[PDB]
RNA sequence: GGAAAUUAGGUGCGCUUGGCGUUUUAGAGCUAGAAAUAGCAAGUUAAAAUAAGGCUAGUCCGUUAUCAACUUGAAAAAGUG
DNA sequence: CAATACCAGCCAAGCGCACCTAATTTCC
DNA sequence: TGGTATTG
């Protein structure tokens, strides 16, 4: 028989259904394997496959990086100890052993328990002299006395183990001694430039304000308040913002047309400043130079809070300052709370459970939790003034190892390490020879373009070696081929030219590539004037004239420039009209002008003989990012340019790659003409063919040479784009189809209809940068937590700066419930309910008529406000374009036509691949003309088609009832998809893989299903009972016969819902290391670390369970007792268990294991017990509900309408008349629950909670009935609420009862089963 | 259906790094007590581990993808109603 | 044994390639 | 949601 397949692909489900030509779902009898008395079973061909979400590889990648870094940090300490090895032996032959075994208890230690000196009196004296490592670090930097070689190592090891970041390039030499002299010098250089209006320097404690422990924004406002007759946005105000590390805009200071934003820390500053200085004049050079000088002394003011005159260890001295002020303020807080609050002294300084100082030091209270807990206490008391001040600056009772230590650059640690090495160098000869070696251990960093230092056993590595020997931080340059590695790092990822697959694409900024883009757009421009009869192309001589006169003069060429600078002069046309380009050209010779600024030799860039060398330069500047390697590769061309040009050309760099190769655009040639593709773009007579025309024109050879130059299924899907979560459904969809084909006797279906379904940390950063760019005060006036931005109106409120944007007024946070959320494009036209199409106005009517885009008067009144929000990234350019669409004519007849086509035709590329994959598997033969025979039509639909169909014919959907809706959607997809194609065969082009009239057609396309149709024109249309194809006469829809088939299909209680059994993978257990306890549930973190002494991990993840049938020793006699039980194999144990299952189980305590009866039971293994009650294995000690509550169809659509409430009044009487359905639905739940759920207490608690709210409105009661299905849903028990009664989940921890039940093995469709009566074992 | 360019936004894969946290130990608690306890003192730091571990022994690899059952397969995938 | 209670590693930087969406121009 | 511990 003939049939079709309906498919519904989702991130966690795949619906499927088989239908016949009468739109019926066939029922069959399938063989039942196993050892039960059942030999077959009747099954309908409809169901859904359910599966856990497929995971992305990010978390696995982050963990693989953390593993590499812990291995290399250990190797750094190992490098340092190897250097210290011989000389440390002469001082203390077991010092490094005590450091290694410091974690062990004294019982397990092989050496004395005090690590540093090996005895107690020396150990106590050390901590008295150096309470923190920073005390020792500072002493070793400043003192000249010879120091103990052990203490030297401990200081150097602490700087190498925690070495600080690498975000700043170059050397750093902290020098804060001249902040005062640098500030006055800045105001001195300002006064020589602005002798008209100068600033007075005296009386300004510029050091204190600019080195204060406040924000860079706060320090700026304080300085300007000190300076009379100035402003934060004045020139000197923006200059100070620069020196402090902010990004102020100098555009308004100099009457500039573009922005002049500068930041001293960005590497573009040296060229941004030159861009600005060329705009405003060279006499302002010292002004920005002095701003740079003052910035160097206050650069690390937050990290170094001690003046660098006293010590060469400002970082350590700042940590000692933290310690001393902690000590002083701790003694004061104690004596204070002792005198004024003696009742609470126990809670603050002894209770670890509370967030006091005890929980701050010994408990789990963080610095923030400590401040929040104690701040009310300090206020109540007197004399806590300075401490409340120290608290609000986050500088009270501070530790030295804190979360905010990420500011410290590695140069700072290196400075103290270099100083220690410079002191003890004189006393220890080996520290002299290895001073650079030790410094290298701290500074060395594997470049990202090198990757893992592997030797042929890493699938991630690409590194190439010069010499086959071990790589260390000292021989890295000599052993690693950084050049070959930095090249492979890119060429392993770059695309090949699809036209010539053996060729790599050019760099996006290649000069040849931009000539191509310019000539490809230029060669299709047409111009017309008054005299000529018809618009003509530009000849070859005209295009070179335009490229030489305009494109090689200005960055971007406008038609305005084209009109007024070529035709107006060279042709003298006083009025010409241009065709093929609006406003301006898209292409541009950006690289040409870039190099022209660097070399100034315009003749050299125009000298065509330098084509190859100029391409090699752009390739080097794109291939590499290390400016040292760039210089080395540009050294072969160093003779052609002066040394200053080489210094500029080396810093300039590009990124990005094109889509075409050099050989395609300017290499291969036509046989007859001998011209390459670029040559045709320059001159093609009067045809002026472009790239697409050239490689498709049979007149020349390009089309053939491209055709001349021209993988598993699992591979093919994994290589697609899109989320790995949706990819999981694609592969399962294919596997589901393959089985259905085998079910139907290996006959292929007529049609396959497929359908595919459609944070706060990123939101808070967007708001933060958005307001800060605009400089508004709404964050200061209204501060929000990042989690609170999950409110749609409140998130919009901050995107709109707390201001209505359809009209010019402010908004109030307190009246959020009274505003409106109108969609820019009406939701009827476009199914876009994202932030890109939402808005927060006061009234939806203040938009104008909802027929179109917001009114032209609205756009004209709010145009400037929307461009401000764009430049603050608070709205996207598309959102701005849509809002401003009214000035561009708004929506048209063509615009409105394209929207409803997008509502029915799926255009997503990911959905096309699924259609391409299925079509490739089904249609494989060829006809007489070697054209593919299309046996199976693959139709693609969107959700709105079946969604409207459900809502038009009252085939309503309630997701919470059960999982049947996944399969029902697949059935309706096959029905609607096949009926639409059989009715309108002309639509196969638009629905099968491989203006006003179009709008009216698509908007009424589904009308053929109805009998009485009301149109927007007011026309009431009547259609016959049976529908047919006009040409063929074949019957398509029988409205008196085929609708009844749908309800018969949707009401079928037996549908095949299958949860995909999966072996669990991932982390072994939870990550938290628990303290020592006397339980044996803990897992050792190392082999010899018994958790009873050292603690360990809890909650291991079971990979899968195994049915174990054997004997166990019982009692002191060790008599063998037979057992049958369920053993959970953890992820950690899995490899050893599968290597030798008998020895693994025998080590667990099982003897004489029946090996042939071991059953691998992965998660979600299905069991049937009594009365069809089903359980699913959540683990070895946890069960999930295994039954689906098939609710009758009459209750489903009644639950829909009663919960949701034209003929809305007619459906209301149905709800009111059938108000008795509630006690029937409840009876349905109770009957189902008492049979399969077995939650007696939870059930009568719902029954009691139900009978309490019987006086509630029917709409309100119908909503909470939907919540009750959480009690009966498939899967894990979950807590739900009924009105205000919260009923907790009833869990199934006893897995004993499954060991005597029937194990059900299901195929992917669930049609093929193997049932095993486990009660027959043991 | 597809290509290149332009503008804007987003996802994926991979590499190189920073700072916390946690765990055990070290940092002599004192006095009065038989002792439980009571009173005071003290607290900020370090080492080491950070998936158990593996052989291929690398400054490498170890949490993604893929998996009903049976009969064959190293595996993918095939064969069976 | 079953019910009940509570628990779960986090934050941050830089670099590169590839791909998707939606709008425009020129084309196959 | 599945593990651990307490509770009962
Ligand atoms: K010992
Ligand atoms: K002022
Ligand atoms: K702690
Ligand atoms: K703490
Ligand atoms: K710490
Ligand atoms: K344009
Ligand atoms: K580059
Ligand atoms: K998983
Ligand atoms: K997996
Ligand atoms: K299965
Ligand atoms: Mg780290
Ligand atoms: Mg390790
Ligand atoms: Mg730490």
PDB file of C-alpha atoms in Angstrom, chain A residues 34 154 178 187 217 415 504 600 854 930 1020 1115 1125 1244 1264 1294 1297:
ATOM      1  CA  UNK A  34      11.926 -12.532  24.649  1.00  0.00           C
ATOM      2  CA  UNK A 154      59.577  29.848  49.021  1.00  0.00           C
ATOM      3  CA  UNK A 178      56.616  62.030  40.425  1.00  0.00           C
ATOM      4  CA  UNK A 187      48.716  71.636  33.333  1.00  0.00           C
ATOM      5  CA  UNK A 217      34.969  57.757  37.160  1.00  0.00           C
ATOM      6  CA  UNK A 415      60.001  42.936  39.588  1.00  0.00           C
ATOM      7  CA  UNK A 504      43.301  28.687  -0.635  1.00  0.00           C
ATOM      8  CA  UNK A 600      53.504  57.464   0.585  1.00  0.00           C
ATOM      9  CA  UNK A 854       4.950  53.521  13.272  1.00  0.00           C
ATOM     10  CA  UNK A 930      20.522  11.129 -16.231  1.00  0.00           C
ATOM     11  CA  UNK A1020     -18.691  34.919   2.675  1.00  0.00           C
ATOM     12  CA  UNK A1115      27.098 -13.550  58.506  1.00  0.00           C
ATOM     13  CA  UNK A1125      20.132  -7.056  42.845  1.00  0.00           C
ATOM     14  CA  UNK A1244      -5.779  12.800  48.566  1.00  0.00           C
ATOM     15  CA  UNK A1264      -4.612  24.584  38.064  1.00  0.00           C
ATOM     16  CA  UNK A1294      13.256   1.529  46.019  1.00  0.00           C
ATOM     17  CA  UNK A1297      10.420  -4.129  42.571  1.00  0.00           C
TER      18      UNK A1297
END
